[PDB]
């Protein structure tokens, strides 16, 4: 009965300097325990956002995280060509840490 977090869109197409939102929803309320990770191709994913709103030290302040009930959103205001990589939504509330199915943002 582990939590399944559905993350959408499954794939994303966007251009430079676009406001893009990737939303993940959990079956149960995970409070504000969601984190957002970014993974470059063939590389270790790096932590973008923790506690579903806070911005990690080191990442540019461009990324933002919003929460609404059992829904979480990772928003990029002015997308950069460097920020074209896979994005993962993670819970930390419950026992099996579960990630989203993944979201790849590709240049349109």
């Amino acid at each position: 009965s582990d939590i399944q977090m559905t993350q959408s869109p499954s794939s994303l197409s966007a251009s430079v300097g676009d406001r893009v939102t990737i939303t993940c929803r959990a079956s149960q309320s995970v409070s504000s325990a969601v984190a957002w990770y970014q993974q470059k191709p063939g590389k270790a994913p790096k932590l973008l956002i923790y506690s579903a709103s806070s911005l990690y030290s080191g990442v540019p302040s461009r990324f933002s995280g919003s929460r609404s009930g059992t829904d979480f959103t990772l928003t990029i205001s002015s997308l950069q060509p460097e920020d074209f990589a896979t994005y993962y939504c993670q819970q930390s509330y419950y026992k099996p840490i579960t990630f989203g199915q993944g979201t790849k943002v590709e240049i349109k």
């Binding site: 409070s31 325990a33 419950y94 026992k95």
Partner: peptide
Amino acid sequence: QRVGEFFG
């Protein structure tokens, strides 16, 4: 630890 991590 088990029950705490499972029960959030």
